Curated annotation (Swiss-Prot), chains A, B, C:
Record localization: Secreted
Disulfide bonds: C61-C93
Domain THD: 4-149
Effect of R24W: Biologically inactive
Interval of the full protein contained in this chain: 85 to 233 of 233
Listed name of the protein: Tumor necrosis factor, soluble form
Extracellular topological domain residue ranges: 1-149
Consequence of changing S78F: Biologically inactive
Length: 149, 149, 149
């Protein structure tokens, strides 16, 4: 069809980073949607359904409570200011307390999605503050995409 | 674009309450959808994608156990009765009773979304049970939207 | 509309099992999509927005830590290999208390969604690993749907 669409996943070969990639199974990047500088570029003006999921993994809560963030930013015009379209935070560890067991693995998914008005050339970014907790070793766990509506 | 659409956000001014607003950047309310009674009113029959996200924050868990709820209801005809379309529940504080420290800000987001057949005149509500844990201070943290498909 | 669409819900009568159903208010199974073997069957090739949400609830965790998974898989041709399109993992328990604390109940919602180019006869499955932990007590808590775009 002619509808600009994109659904990229995190390249499981990009150890320690969130590399969006469409060279994988069940991924899309068609009709003007481009992947430029790890961001998606909007080919036309209009409404788009934007979304994303990232899966976090760690184990045990080794001091320093981690705040997990996930945002889809918009950089209008042709590299203007970065503004968050969708944003969600999570804390995987509350405790960490002395004496006892340890290393109980934890998993924390985050999903963001919304309908927005985008101008030609705008750039979308799906970002995270903790690429070191990123769990992309298996499929469907981390993804980002948009569809013109 | 001729399709009934909306994407409202939590008014950051709202004195400790959740007040949907379409008067903030990257917000929508077009082609017939009206903001009426903090609810969204459908201008015509048809399929509709309705989504919503709320973020919750807090420091420490003053003993007790909080339950966080979020739910988009449907109130059809000419004022019928609320019926759950989408609903979620979360549990922030799993433990807290002995003393040996304090402070540890937690974050809990909840996302709801689905495709629904509605009639002209139906209104949609997205309510939480605890506006006192609501984190509508910045970004695209709290939003309610819909779109004709 | 004339767009293939479905939005099925967890049948409350199927206690302790995940049985999808369009046999309830605000559910949909129209324009070619079908419920076969508890799976939604794709009636035509196209870009589909796929989503699903499950709510897990449990009474404490007397020892051992549970893992909660929720995936949407695609089976092409007709009973061909399985590939996860959407997948999220979660762990409702990180502790375990030998006396003192008493089996506090937990809630864990998981939402999954994306757009995929599917083909006619393709079957999609929305799975979970712990049906004994599924919460379809109230409406809107467990659903599965698709829509052609």
């Amino acid at each position: 069809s002619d509808k600009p669409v994109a659904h990229v996943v995190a390249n499981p070969q990009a150890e320690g980073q969130l590399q969006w990639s469409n060279r994988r199974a069940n991924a899309l990047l068609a009709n003007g949607v481009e992947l430029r500088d790890n961001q998606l570029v909007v080919p036309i003006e209009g409404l788009f359904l934007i979304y994303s999921q990232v899966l976090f993994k760690g184990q045990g809560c080794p001091s320093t409570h981690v705040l997990l963030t996930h945002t889809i930013s918009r950089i209008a015009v042709s590299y203007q200011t970065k503004v968050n379209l969708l944003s969600a935070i999570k804390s995987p560890c509350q405790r960490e307390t002395p004496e006892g067991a340890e290393a109980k693995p934890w998993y924390e998914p985050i999903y963001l999605g919304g309908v927005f008005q985008l101008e030609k050339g705008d750039r979308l970014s799906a970002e995270i503050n903790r690429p070191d907790y990123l769990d992309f070793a298996e499929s469907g766990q981390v993804y980002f995409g948009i569809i013109a509506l």
